[PDB]
Ligand binder design. Structure first.
Ligand SMILES: NC(=O)c1ccc[n+]([C@@H]2O[C@H](COP(=O)(O)O)[C@@H](O)[C@H]2O)c1
Ligand SMILES: NC(=O)c1ccc[n+]([C@@H]2O[C@H](COP(=O)(O)O)[C@@H](O)[C@H]2O)c1
Lengths: 479, 463, 479, 482
């Protein structure tokens, strides 16, 4: 089902230069593209197809890794680069894109790199062009909704023209190689699944932490907040991958179908539940990176009711996971850039050792998705009569230094060209994720909850550290 | 106080025990097959003191102290008058014990407050261990007896129960289900020097499987005690050995393979064959391998693959628990071996724990998407650069000083070992089975290589 | 939510509108479940006004005697209508309040179903106000089934469609999930570890007599395994729904349907068996063979037998033995989960049979759940003491004497007047059912498997007992 | 060979043992050569007291087993000499009474532990002791562990442990014997027999009667010493034991002793929380008005007749699983039974629906009937508007119905035959006894320092209100049919 005609919308955007064109050339330069591939890039600004190509070369030079860069391999990729100045608002403009496009039976992959308000106009023009017709796919990587209603608004109006199979919603997460091995680690190994239940598993937690701020995306970040921005998709995907029941086989939908279910089955957070289970944290002026950094209001310059931090004790309510607290924690201006997963297991049924002897420490498996990728499992070992909880450590980066550090889109981009792709979100996953997330905002918006701030680099609001510790567990911290 | 190390003037107590004993610092009495002087025993100790940890010997004023305080005394072990030339260890052998035990006690008196450590196989047939034990227990106290397994005291052997029972993840699969087979391997690069004749009567099997490994097996297969009591531990090991599937005269043909180290190379030098070194024809098995079966609710149908040898290509000690594979491969044929997870701990050669894991390879939606096996390492001897890599024997003497057997073999344990062992012997001897020569530095007879492979399993090689 | 006062009946002339549907409806109105204000169209044209006489003939001799009463019948007789029309002719179909919902029940054949849609749309009956139910044997091939389904879908929304399987209404079939997931003892055992094989048997003493002509089309495997027995497999293997939802439960069956090991053309010689009932004894009486009863020589199976495999985490490697049969020794539908034997016999072989535990759900004619345990016989023996297998028996027929509900159909039917539809199948379910069964038929046709004769009343072809025998498994029978 | 019944005048001998022996004679499991010599403390001195034994046969033995002709064959194997354990000098009369040493002598002390030691001293003078001689004892085996040990120590000093065959009446009943067959002869249970899958265990011996003619012996001990140190504690070991490798006497025991060694100490502190005591009180029993225990005693009474405990085995398998023991006299019904409540379903797929989904339960009634059954949830049949109904149900097995044919025989006949056989299979070991004794001695001390008072319950009532609350605080209840 590979597509030899693809159209790049929003080609004027930073993402297309920053994450799209470099990924493409990276696929080119290695030969994953059928050389009979058309790529009709479209932007409002005016450039000659040879012209646009020169702009792309700048982007390729300013973004593609130097080792990949080759003046021959760039040129071979540019001769598959064709552009066409078009207004969306005017559907009559699209026909010029249509003439460039390769025959429909070969098919068209339609990337949308714009704003969700701009989505509605563009789809209409394609049908007159004929690009709207089946044999056309469609990817989306935008603020395509903040609540259900918009997402339903945006999706319902799309599903009018295409179908779910045509739609390829994309999550930057799942591009990540580390995110992907997680299914392999759980289902390529038979030790984890026996204990991957409510019994022998005590608490689990997610922490996507970053020192960076909302530098540049502020004003636009102020609309999402950490919870709309990172946890809505990115983090709930981690939960799905870690809690999903296995599919019978590695199918796009069957994999999705289990994640969809995990999204569907979770403890809802209600009005009364939110004060107990939710924590907010804005950023105080603080020194981060050894350099003093300004508060959120400092940079924002305006009153703001957005988070930057979130931390939620979620519950998966399925036979397997019912009653296992899932402790989420994301935020900016944190002590380290370290996204990580810690599964903590229930302690041994009986400590047959002396009370004096080191208290047993529950076995825990830790995976850090970013920046370093490592997998470690806690154990107890008698010391050369005492013990130390010592770790069985492994670094993926050490394991495969040679493998190329491809970009997260290079991979995502091809799945879309190749055929049905499991790394792309579905409406069923999308509606459920809002279901949980939305209420949370409405319930705590209805509760006049206002974020408790911390000085930047403080590890977040004190109110947080107690959400976990009033149940008796601590957030994993390096020592 | 005053001890007696009968056979301290020997290899047993020149590197393994007495050289290690330097750390164990009372007047020290030591018997001697080569009966030298008081100062000379210290001088002989001083050469062994030279063969000790460089830092600990250099730091110790003990080497000066050893010259300062020393005891030597014609052992006269055979003589009823073997004594007078508090606790004595029998660094002697089973033969150098029975008469030795009878006479050493009589000259200085005996009864309680006297040591009783076999420090030996202390038996050939059951009757040997039986008779020899029986005459001891009727003359000592059961608490006084300290049968010694050089291994059990080794710290790496010890953390197993902490490993096994301090960790939730290992036990759910530790079953008949969830384990495909277990694998124990005692390797040495060395041949036999000066011990071949004693070894030749004993056999490799008797020297290591009966004492060094069977305990290891218990530690690996035993059901836990309610609490970590000396007898609570031992009572559950006894349960293991007594649940060992007997090797009949029929089970020996298919389930065992004998070997013998031939002539070859070891490292950068080349060594000669075994019998030629002996100078007399030997039918002793330098190398033996067993397909032991333990039958219990937990394990019935889990093969235990034994392997200890001499002049082996490399010396390594470790256990390979290979787990029963995933009930289903949720992936396509094209990507991933999906090789079974295994837990491996190096023991005597180095202390490390590693678990086999399978991780998806960095990949793009190419036609092939393989997942590679990866291991989680812990260097038990690299994280504890603070803890002294102190010898294993040194600690056991502390337990003797306590007078509580924290780790000494029990008769009800021991008698379980021979009954199984001797059934291999009486049996395969009744079938006229003979040892197979193997090149020095190779991996025993090729008859073994087929023992592992008729099941669909292979031994463990790092490469 | 039906707002429905109108019922549509097709195929009344069949031995189904009389034996099951007409008595079923008798209950729906004789206990206040049918509105007082609340049609009969014949696949075979019949003289009219016969039905008021016909129901008394057909019902009296079909409905339960205790249930039967002179009064209840008159109201039912009045409500009933009878127009003599032909499915082949659309104009006939046109010859019914709009406000009342029209619910269309199709008790004809799959081929006749398309015509009914053809006349309804044109007669004025098909309406958003119309809900249509369809018989279980719809289609002989996935493409034929997909053909009819696609046509109905344009005419009717999926919700209006109510795909019928009578097995899903049988009480013993319904509580199967309650048995499995309302009880924690069963689930730990329900895995590749702890289950040796599952064993299903729908047994029948009666060969088709009137229906042989229509049967010869659909093999015993098509008539029963496609719908009835294949649902049983879902209930006995389906992973738990997080919550019981009509679609999620159907969704999880679909997952089970899709995880069956493909019976190709190479796995048909080894994992399937066909049979045709020869001549023998039925009730001390001599009854004739298939080919005698039906003159045309035929390769049709009056008996089938499968060794199906579910290849997921839970079930990979657990054999599934399915044996629908005609002219068999008994009418006993019965699932027999046989569990893995003790990991070790800590008991001497001489005194121990140590037979494996078996969960036997008897679905008909008697409701009788039971479990088998081995218990020591009471005697004084110094050695080799004997141990005897014993059964813990239950009787849903004896325990629920008070509940007193006669038939599955009345619940399913009433449900269509209610519009619930949880029992009714879903399209995605249907199509995964066919593709698996279609392969088994194609492989035998490509592999030229021909039914073996079995004297009528002998469990089946000798070949079945050997399909189990090679694997050590036997066919459970009361001994 | 030759049997001796020390304690011959005992009511227990009259009902439990003399009927059992008749059954062995009737079935011809008893040698014609074998002769039984009985010494009774206070009555029926004449050898023709067989009539007194025959009286015992009538009021106790089953009619079908009873056979007028068969009695005489048995009674003319009965030889009685009046003897006093306290005076050794009269032990001789038991000797000079058949008892050829080569045939050998099987000695039964239906006497109390206090009388145990004295009887042994007479036998050694009589030449009864040492070779060719066995020895049986009884359930109490001493007031305390030191008390049992002092009597114990001298037994092994006199006969080799091979020859002591201590009797725990429960171990040997067929329903008690099957337990291990239940546990390890099937694969269904053990997946869940752990601290994951189980809510709690419940062992309960109930009795409609009080103590009559047993009161003087009874007020020395108490119900826990009477039917717990030996009986109910054996049952606990069988329920919680890790399986043996293969079914050998010591292989079974060595794990049972561990279950006893595993149990957590009640201690002085836990008794307010884990111990409930009762004193049988005047009321109804059997439909009859029966007298209160103190009034029957004729003296103040500190002994329970009822106890209820929250036992804890602290091993890998059972750590933290409460075991609710409850043995009583004048309880509403006679019925020994075990109820395993399995930990409830992990999550409910039909949580919205009304039905409770009660936790599964394995019920084994050892007495008075023999029965195993299983709690399962199954959907209630209904036509449902919206919402669903689920009713719990029982999978039935009446062992007696399954094997009615095989003769039903007294546990003692199995227990006694092994004695002549010289078999220790249903006979307790000293290590078994000490572990049971230390636990009991510690609860008794805890009761002593806290001065707990048996709390009076009515006759025919479910014990004291104190016991119901101890079960209630967990949420657990007591199984009561209906
Ligand atoms: N007893 C029955 O007649 C019965 C049973 C199961 C399915 N069906 C199917 O429903 C329809 C019934 O038509 P007849 O009543 O003419 O057989 C057909 O599609 C038939 O194959 C009938
Ligand atoms: N039913 C019983 O009498 C019974 C039950 C268990 C043990 N015992 C023991 O047997 C002897 C009974 O003697 P009495 O018949 O005088 O009660 C005592 O040692 C007693 O502890 C009696």
């Amino acid at each position: 089902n590979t597509v030899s005609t693809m159209i790049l919308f929003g080609s004027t955007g930073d993402l297309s230069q920053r994450m799209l064109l470099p990924a493409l050339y990276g696929l080119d330069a290695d030969g994953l593209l059928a050389d009979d591939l058309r790529i009709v890039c479209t932007s409002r600004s005016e450039y000659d197809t040879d012209g646009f190509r020169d702009f792309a070369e700048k982007a390729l030079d300013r973004f593609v890794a130097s080792d990949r860069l080759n003046d021959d391999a760039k040129a071979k990729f540019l001769n598959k680069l064709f552009y066409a100045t078009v207004d969306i608002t005017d559907p009559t403009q699209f026909g010029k894109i249509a003439d460039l496009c390769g025959p429909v039976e070969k098919g068209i992959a339609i990337y949308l790199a714009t704003s969700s308000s701009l989505f509605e106009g563009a789809i209409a023009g394609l049908k007159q062009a004929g690009l709207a017709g089946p044999t056309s796919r469609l990817a989306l990587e935008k603020p395509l909704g903040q609540d259900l209603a918009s997402s339903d608004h945006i999706n319902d109006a799309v599903l009018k023209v295409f179908s779910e199979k045509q739609v390829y919603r994309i999550d930057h997460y799942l591009g990540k190689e580390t995110v992907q091995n997680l299914l392999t680690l759980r289902f390529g190994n038979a030790l984890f699944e026996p204990l991957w239940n409510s019994k022998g598993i005590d608490h689990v937690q997610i922490s996507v932490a970053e020192t960076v701020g909302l530098e540049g995306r502020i004003g636009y970040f102020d609309s999402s907040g950490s919870l709309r921005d990172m946890v809505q998709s990115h983090i709930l995907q981690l939960v799905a991958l870690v809690a999903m029941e296995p599919p019978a086989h590695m199918e796009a939908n069957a994999v999705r179908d289990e994640k969809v279910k995990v999204f569907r089955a979770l403890r809802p957070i209600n009005n009364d539940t939110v004060i107990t289970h939710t924590v907010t944290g804005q950023y105080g002026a603080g020194v981060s990176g050894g350099k003093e950094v300004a508060g959120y209001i400092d940079e924002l310059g305006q009153p703001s009711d957005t988070e930057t931090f979130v931390a939620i004790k979620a519950h998966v309510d399925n036979w397997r996971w019912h009653g296992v607290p899932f402790y989420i924690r994301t935020g900016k201006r944190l002590p380290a850039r370290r996204s990580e997963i810690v599964v903590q297991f229930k302690p041994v049924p009986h400590s047959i050792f002396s009370s004096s002897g080191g208290i047993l420490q529950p076995n825990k498996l830790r995976i850090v998705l970013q920046p370093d990728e490592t997998i470690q499992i806690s154990i107890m070992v008698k010391e050369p009569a005492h013990m130390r909880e010592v770790w069985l450590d492994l670094s993926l980066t050490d394991v495969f230094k040679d493998r190329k550090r491809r970009i997260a889109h290079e991979r995502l981009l091809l799945d879309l060209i190749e055929g049905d792709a499991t790394l792309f979100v579905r409406r069923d996953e999308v509606e459920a994720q809002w279901i949980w997330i939305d209420g949370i905002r409405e319930g705590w918006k209805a509760n006049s909850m206002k974020p408790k701030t911390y000085v930047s680099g403080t590890w977040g609001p004190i109110t947080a550290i107690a959400l976990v510790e009033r149940d008796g567990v601590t957030w994993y911290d390096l020592e």
